[PDB]
Amino acid sequence: AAAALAAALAQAL
Structure with missing residues (x-):
């Protein structure tokens, strides 16, 4: 989850 x-x-940026 951290990586995701x-x-x-x-x-996005």
């Missing part, structure tokens, strides 16, 4: 959510953020 971190990555979401990265892509």
Whole structure:
């Protein structure tokens, strides 16, 4: 979950 959510953020921005 940590990685999944971190990555979401990265892509959005």
